[PDB]
Design a protein around this ligand. Structure first.
Ligand SMILES: CO[C@@H]1C[C@H](CO)N(c2ncnc3[nH]ccc23)C1
Length: 167
């Protein structure tokens, strides 16, 4: 039993809701919140900008030190950093950004990072300004993630479209 509330069950291990991931994290304080990161951990907009702004820029400060030490992530890769006031940990995961010309095939690799954590509050990878088909991303999520994932989808029309089209 966990404290997530109001989620629609899609499969044994994937759940979904129309909500801001920042608000879900503020309420649940999950062990892991997933950030929709880029390779430079520059948290400029979307989920990343929202998470970072909710940390009063502490996420960005920590991320800049990470990059200075380790260099950029790989597309499809991840790193574990602090969750600051929102969660115990933040798993920064890089889905491909089609508006940058990044390879959409890497979306499965990106979701594989979720399997290293038993429970996660996560966004839909490569959605929004990353430019991928959200129906496909939800499909890849369900067909790749085996651990328990709670997907918070901010955009109401997107949530409704995803539910009505899910197979
Ligand atoms: C079209 O919106 C993009 C894609 C995705 C699903 O709507 N996004 C979010 N998902 C969950 N929490 C969020 N907080 C702030 C943004 C956000 C932003």
């Amino acid at each position: 039993v966990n404290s997530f509330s109001g989620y629609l069950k899609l499969t044994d291990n994937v759940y979904i809701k129309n909500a801001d991931i920042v608000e879900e994290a503020k309420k649940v304080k999950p062990t892991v919140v997933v950030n929709a990161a880029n390779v430079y951990l520059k948290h400029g907009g979307g989920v990343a900008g929202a998470l970072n702004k909710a940390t009063n820029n502490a996420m960005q400060v920590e991320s800049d030190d990470y990059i200075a030490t380790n260099g950029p992530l790989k597309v499809g890769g991840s790193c574990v950093l602090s969750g600051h006031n929102l969660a115990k940990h933040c798993l920064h995961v890089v889905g491909p950004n089609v508006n940058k010309g990044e390879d959409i095939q890497l979306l499965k690799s990106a979701y594989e990072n979720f399997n290293q954590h038993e429970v996660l509050l996560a966004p839909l990878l490569s959605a929004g300004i990353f430019g991928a088909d959200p129906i496909h991303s939800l499909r890849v999520c369900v067909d790749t993630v085996r651990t328990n994932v709670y997907l918070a989808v901010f955009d109401k029309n997107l949530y409704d479209k995803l539910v009505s089209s899910f197979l």
